[PDB]
Each structure stands twice: as structure tokens, then as C-alpha cells.
Amino acid sequence: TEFKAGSAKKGATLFKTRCLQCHTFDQGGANKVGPNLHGIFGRHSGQAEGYSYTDANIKKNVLWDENNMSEYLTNPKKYIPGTKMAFGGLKKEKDRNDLITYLKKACE
Amino acid sequence: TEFKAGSAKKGATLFKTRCLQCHTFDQGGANKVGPNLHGIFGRHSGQAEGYSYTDANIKKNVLWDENNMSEYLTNPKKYIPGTKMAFGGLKKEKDRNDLITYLKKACE
Ligand code: HEM
Ligand code: HEM
Structure with missing residues (x-):
């Protein structure tokens, strides 16, 4: 895990x-x-108020940071098997860097 | 040549x-x-006012449309050998569709 700053515009x-x-x-x-992603960085998984997560998400208790996020976005079901998030993943690191650059300034 | 509408936001x-x-x-x-690209679609190559093109660009006399543009953006030097445009190309069609969608509404 080693993420680098990308384009927020692009993200x-x-x-x-x-x-x-x-x-x-x-x-x-x-x-x-x-779930709403505001303030996700530094939080653990399954903690958005009023949202009904899977047992899978909850139990992984992932701490959310930029490198976790990047491994996460690669292949979501692989990262948290049993997840309901029906997203296939961001294959290109460059895409992931961009998206995590924007999320980092936008979710804070 | 067969371009499809993409995301202008993304483009x-x-x-x-x-x-x-x-x-x-x-x-x-x-x-x-x-050169400034305003009004490029439907124009021929080498005609931006006050710009110093290569003999190569000029002579190709490309008519600029969305499918030309897409083959162009794939590999610029391949499309117009002798071009000074130091851009390697947009490999992914999806990227090219996006960019040409935006150029189409933005350069008009
Ligand atoms: C690349 C765009 C996306 C990003 C950055 C993203 C990010 C995330 C993150 C970080 C979580 C974990 C939540 C937490 O632990 O608080 C999550 C969960 C979730 N996302 Fe996404 N997601 C994306 C795309 C999608 C899409 C397109 C869908 C809908 C088809 C979706 C549906 C869900 C669901 C249902 C959950 C909760 C999973 C569960 O409870 O097991 N996400 N998302
Ligand atoms: C994907 C982004 C780009 C697009 C959509 C684009 C588009 C074009 C088009 C359509 C032309 C033909 C001009 C005409 O016939 O009027 C052109 C020419 C040119 N572009 Fe680009 N271009 C891009 C990237 C670049 C970049 C990054 C550079 C600088 C490193 C550049 C430098 C040039 C030059 C110098 C010419 C004139 C070439 C010549 O006279 O032989 N372009 N560009």
C-alpha cells in the first residue's frame, strides 16, 4: 500500500x-x-448512522484510510466477501489515486 | 469509424x-x-488564424469531425506523420468518446 496524490478534478x-x-x-x-461517505477517513467500516450494512462489512471492521480505500476499490467483493456493494472495481491505480484524492478533500 | 456519446463532465x-x-x-x-480549437468541427486541418502549423498537418487537409478526431486521438503521429503535437494518444475508446463529447459541445 502506497497511494500517491492524483487529480481531484479528475477524481x-x-x-x-x-x-x-x-x-x-x-x-x-x-x-x-x-451509505453517506462524509467523514469516512479514519472511521471504521459499518458505522454510518441509520444505514443497514451487511454482516460482512461490519465484521471486517476496516479502518478507512487512503491505502485501504485503494485496495478496497480494486475489487470490493474480494476485499470484503459478503458485501452488497455491486461495484466491480477500479482496475487502474491512476483512476484510484484520482478518486481517493477527491474523496480525501471532499469527505472531510 | 463509429463514435458514441460519452460523459461531457468526464471529457x-x-x-x-x-x-x-x-x-x-x-x-x-x-x-x-x-492552436486554439474553437470551431474545429467541420473545419479542415491547418486553418487556425495566426498559428504556425507543420507542413504535415496542413497537407493532410483533414476535415475535422467526431470519427476523424477519435482516430486522430488514438495515435496522432500515426494519423499525421510529421506532426509536432507531442501527444502519445488516448488508447481507450471510452476516454476518446468522453473527450470528443465535451469538445463537440465546448468548441462550438
Ligand atoms: C467508485 C465509487 C464508489 C465508492 C468510492 C464507494 C465507496 C464505498 C465505501 C468506502 C463503502 C464502505 C462503507 C462504510 O464502511 O461506511 C461503501 C459501501 C457500500 N456501497 Fe459503495 N462505493 C462506490 C460505488 C458504489 C456503487 C456504484 C454502489 C451501488 C451499485 C455502491 C453501493 C454500496 C453499498 C450497498 C454499500 C454498503 C455495503 C454493505 O453494507 O455490505 N457503492 N461504498
Ligand atoms: C487530448 C488533448 C488534445 C487534443 C484534443 C488536441 C487536439 C488537437 C487538434 C484537433 C489539432 C489539429 C489542429 C488543426 O488542424 O487546427 C492539434 C494540433 C496541435 N496540438 Fe494538440 N491536442 C491535444 C493535446 C496536445 C498537447 C498535450 C500538446 C502539447 C504537448 C499539443 C500540441 C499541439 C500542436 C503543437 C499542434 C499543431 C501541430 C502541427 O502544426 O503540426 N496538443 N491538437
């Missing part, structure tokens, strides 16, 4: 294009198919 | 990230390393 459009369909990142943002 | 960040370094797309936009 924000990855977000709109691959994650918005199921999540919000804003404070005061609502849970939708996926 | 605009490709632009910022791969083309802005050398071009503008705005009307009233200045020539920089590369």
Missing part, C-alpha cells in the same frame, strides 16, 4: 460517473443505496 | 488533464503551444 468526475449512483459525500448528505 | 476533465497544457477551446481563446 470528482470518477465519483459522478461511478459512485454517485449509490452514494453522497456531503455532510448532511443522505444514505441512498450506499 | 472536460480529460481536457484539463491532457490538452489544456497546450490548447484553448474558447472563442477568443489564444493559440499557445497548440
Whole structure:
């Protein structure tokens, strides 16, 4: 695990294009198919208020940081087997760096 | 040649990230390393006012459309051998569709 800073501009459009369909990142943002991601960095998995996670997510108790996030986004079901997140993953590291750069400034 | 509509949102960040370094797309936009692209679609190659093209660009007399543009962006030097445009190309069609979707609404 070794993430590098990418384009937030580029990361924000990855977000709109691959994650918005199921999540919000804003404070005061609502849970939708996926939980609201505001303040995810440094939190553990399964703790968004009012959201119904899988036993799988909960139990993994992942601490969310930028390198976890990157391994996570590679192949979600592989990272947390039993997850309901129906996303196949961001194959290219460059894509992942971008998206995690934006999430890092946007979810805070 | 068969281009399909992509994300303009996504195409605009490709632009910022791969083309802005050398071009503008705005009307009233200045020539920089590369010529200003405002109104490129339907024009022929080598005709931006006040810009010093290569003999290569000029002579190809490419008519600029969305499918030309896409073959062009794949491998620029291959499309116009003798070109000074020091860009290696957009390998992924998806990337090219996005970028040409945005250019199409932005350069008009
Ligand atoms: C690349 C875009 C995405 C990002 C960055 C992202 C990020 C995340 C993260 C970090 C979690 C863990 C939540 C936590 O532990 O608080 C999560 C969960 C979840 N996401 Fe995504 N996700 C993305 C795409 C999607 C998409 C497209 C969907 C809908 C098809 C989706 C649906 C879900 C669901 C249902 C959960 C909860 C899983 C469970 O409870 O087992 N996500 N997402
Ligand atoms: C994917 C981003 C880019 C796009 C969409 C793009 C588009 C184009 C187009 C359509 C032309 C033909 C001009 C005409 O016939 O009027 C051109 C020429 C040119 N571009 Fe790019 N370009 C891109 C990236 C770059 C970059 C990064 C550079 C600088 C390193 C650059 C430098 C040039 C130059 C110097 C020319 C003129 C070539 C010649 O006279 O032989 N372009 N560009």
C-alpha cells in the first residue's frame, strides 16, 4: 500500500460517473443505496448512522484510510466477501489515486 | 469509424488533464503551444488564424469531425506523420468518446 496524490478534478468526475449512483459525500448528505461517505477517513467500516450494512462489512471492521480505500476499490467483493456493494472495481491505480484524492478533500 | 456519446463532465476533465497544457477551446481563446480549437468541427486541418502549423498537418487537409478526431486521438503521429503535437494518444475508446463529447459541445 502506497497511494500517491492524483487529480481531484479528475477524481470528482470518477465519483459522478461511478459512485454517485449509490452514494453522497456531503455532510448532511443522505444514505441512498450506499451509505453517506462524509467523514469516512479514519472511521471504521459499518458505522454510518441509520444505514443497514451487511454482516460482512461490519465484521471486517476496516479502518478507512487512503491505502485501504485503494485496495478496497480494486475489487470490493474480494476485499470484503459478503458485501452488497455491486461495484466491480477500479482496475487502474491512476483512476484510484484520482478518486481517493477527491474523496480525501471532499469527505472531510 | 463509429463514435458514441460519452460523459461531457468526464471529457472536460480529460481536457484539463491532457490538452489544456497546450490548447484553448474558447472563442477568443489564444493559440499557445497548440492552436486554439474553437470551431474545429467541420473545419479542415491547418486553418487556425495566426498559428504556425507543420507542413504535415496542413497537407493532410483533414476535415475535422467526431470519427476523424477519435482516430486522430488514438495515435496522432500515426494519423499525421510529421506532426509536432507531442501527444502519445488516448488508447481507450471510452476516454476518446468522453473527450470528443465535451469538445463537440465546448468548441462550438
Ligand atoms: C467508485 C465509487 C464508489 C465508492 C468510492 C464507494 C465507496 C464505498 C465505501 C468506502 C463503502 C464502505 C462503507 C462504510 O464502511 O461506511 C461503501 C459501501 C457500500 N456501497 Fe459503495 N462505493 C462506490 C460505488 C458504489 C456503487 C456504484 C454502489 C451501488 C451499485 C455502491 C453501493 C454500496 C453499498 C450497498 C454499500 C454498503 C455495503 C454493505 O453494507 O455490505 N457503492 N461504498
Ligand atoms: C487530448 C488533448 C488534445 C487534443 C484534443 C488536441 C487536439 C488537437 C487538434 C484537433 C489539432 C489539429 C489542429 C488543426 O488542424 O487546427 C492539434 C494540433 C496541435 N496540438 Fe494538440 N491536442 C491535444 C493535446 C496536445 C498537447 C498535450 C500538446 C502539447 C504537448 C499539443 C500540441 C499541439 C500542436 C503543437 C499542434 C499543431 C501541430 C502541427 O502544426 O503540426 N496538443 N491538437
